[PDB]
C-alpha cells in the first residue's frame, strides 16, 4: 500500500497502467515550474529542507552530480544500466553509484515547414549561412508579416545554455578543467544576434521559452525552429495549424563545422527523504521499463531509452524520423558534468538572454561569462 507524489513538471496515463496492475498503489503528479532551471531552483529548496512530501522526482539529464553529490536521491543499489543507451547509463551513474533510472533521451532538432521549403525548391540548410539564404527567400515570396525566418531560445532559462553551445560545439570547441574559447564564444553570441539584427527572427527573441517556440512554430508563424522531440506529438495532433508540413532535420553547422546538437533527456530519481522507498522504486523500475519507453514515444514523441525502440515498426509507423534520429542522440554533445550546473547554467543563460535584448555586447558577454565559469569550474 502506498500514495506516492511524483514531480513531473501522457505521463498520467504511464501512472494509470501502474495503478491498474498494482493493487493499493495510486500515484499523484506534483509540479514546480516549466523550464528546466525553474524545477532545479524548486527542489533545491525543498531538498535542502529534507522535505519528505515527494517519492519520486523527474530530474534533467544535467542534474545527476548535484543529485548524488547533495545525496538527495537513494541510489538503485547493484543496478546494472547496460540495456540503456551509453549516453545515458554514463549520466546517470556518479562515482560509481547508480543515481536514477533513464526516463527518455532527448536532442535538438531542426524543425521546417516542409511547404514552405518545397514551394520554394529549398533544401533543408546543413549551416546557418543556407538557413540565412532560405528564410530570406521565403519571407521575399511570402509578404507575410507574422512568418518568423528561425525561432530559437533567448529567454534566461536552461534551453539557453544549449542555444549558446550548438555554435561553439559546431566549431569543434568543448567547455571541459575549464576550457575557455573566447572567439568561439563571441562568434556564438554574435551569430544569435546576428538573427535578430537581420530580421530572420523576432526583435524580442530574448523573450522566447522552448514550448513559446513550440506554439509559435504549430501555428503556423515560422519557417524554421530550433526544439526537442516532444513538440512533434503537438505539431500532429488536434489544435495545429501544421499537420504533415512539418520536417526534421539535423541542426545546421556553422561555417566550415559539424552539425552538432545538445543532449538532453530526464531520468526517475528517489528522494532520500521519501517514506515510501521500496514502493517509489518499484514505480521507478516500471516508468524506465521498455514498454513505457515505447509508450513514451508512440503517444508523446519523447525519444527512446533503450535503441532497439528507435526501428521498431510500431514507433516508426507513428514517428517516421525516429529510424534516422538515434545517431542524432548517440553523437549529441552534452553540457557539463558538475554538482555545480546550477552555476555554470546561470552564467550562460543570464549572458545570452542580455547579449539578445542588447543589454551587453557579444564580446563583453563572452568576458563576463568566462570570468563567472573560471569560479565554478
Ligand atoms: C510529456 C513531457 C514533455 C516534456 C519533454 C521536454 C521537456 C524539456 O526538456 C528539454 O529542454 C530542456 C530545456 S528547457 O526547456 O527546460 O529550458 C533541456 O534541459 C532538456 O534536457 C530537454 O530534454
Redesign the pocket.
Given at each position: 500500500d502506498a500514495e506516492l507524489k511524483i514531480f513531473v513538471s501522457?505521463?498520467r496515463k504511464a501512472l494509470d497502467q501502474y495503478e491498474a496492475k498494482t493493487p493499493g498503489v495510486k500515484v499523484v503528479i506534483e509540479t514546480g515550474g516549466n523550464?528546466?532551471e525553474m524545477q532545479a531552483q524548486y527542489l533545491n529548496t525543498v531538498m535542502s529542507a529534507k522535505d519528505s512530501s515527494l517519492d519520486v522526482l523527474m530530474l534533467?539529464?544535467?542534474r545527476p552530480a548535484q543529485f548524488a553529490t547533495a545525496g538527495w536521491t537513494s541510489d538503485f543499489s547493484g543496478k546494472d544500466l547496460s540495456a540503456y543507451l551509453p549516453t545515458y547509463a554514463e549520466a546517470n551513474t556518479v562515482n560509481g553509484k547508480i543515481v536514477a533510472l533513464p526516463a527518455f533521451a532527448?536532442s535538438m532538432f531542426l524543425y521546417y515547414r516542409k511547404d514552405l521549403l518545397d514551394k520554394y525548391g529549398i533544401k533543408p540548410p546543413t549551416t546557418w549561412d543556407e538557413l540565412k539564404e532560405a528564410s530570406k527567400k521565403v519571407m521575399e515570396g511570402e509578404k507575410n508579416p507574422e512568418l518568423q525566418g528561425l525561432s530559437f531560445?533567448g529567454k534566461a532559462?536552461?534551453?539557453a545554455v544549449?542555444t549558446f553551445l550548438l555554435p561553439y560545439w559546431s566549431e569543434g570547441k568543448s567547455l571541459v578543467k575549464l576550457n575557455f574559447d573566447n572567439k568561439a564564444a563571441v562568434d556564438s553570441l554574435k551569430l544569435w544576434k546576428s538573427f535578430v539584427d537581420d530580421g530572420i527572427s523576432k526583435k524580442n527573441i530574448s523573450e522566447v521559452?522552448?514550448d513559446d517556440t513550440r506554439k509559435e512554430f504549430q501555428a503556423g508563424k515560422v519557417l524554421f525552429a530550433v526544439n526537442?522531440s516532444?513538440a512533434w506529438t503537438h505539431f500532429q495532433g488536434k489544435e495545429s495549424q501544421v499537420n504533415d508540413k512539418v520536417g526534421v532535420a539535423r541542426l545546421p553547422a556553422v561555417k566550415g563545422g559539424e552539425q552538432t546538437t545538445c543532449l538532453?533527456?530526464?531520468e526517475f530519481g528517489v528522494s532520500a527523504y521519501s517514506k515510501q522507498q521500496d514502493e517509489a522504486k518499484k514505480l521507478v523500475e516500471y516508468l524506465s521499463s521498455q514498454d513505457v519507453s515505447k509508450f513514451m514515444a508512440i503517444n508523446?514523441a519523447?525519444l527512446p531509452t533503450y535503441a532497439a525502440l528507435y526501428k521498431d515498426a510500431d514507433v516508426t509507423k507513428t514517428i517516421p524520423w525516429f529510424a534516422d534520429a538515434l545517431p542524432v542522440v548517440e553523437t549529441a554533445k552534452a553540457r557539463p558534468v558538475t554538482p555545480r550546473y546550477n552555476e555554470v547554467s546561470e552564467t550562460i543563460r543570464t549572458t545570452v538572454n542580455g547579449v539578445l535584448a542588447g543589454v551587453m555586447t557579444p564580446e563583453d558577454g563572452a568576458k563576463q561569462m568566462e570570468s563567472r565559469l573560471r569560479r565554478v569550474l
Open positions: 501522457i505521463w523550464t528546466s534533467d539529464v544535467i532527448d531560445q532559462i536552461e534551453g544549449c521559452a522552448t526537442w516532444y538532453g533527456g530526464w508523446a519523447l
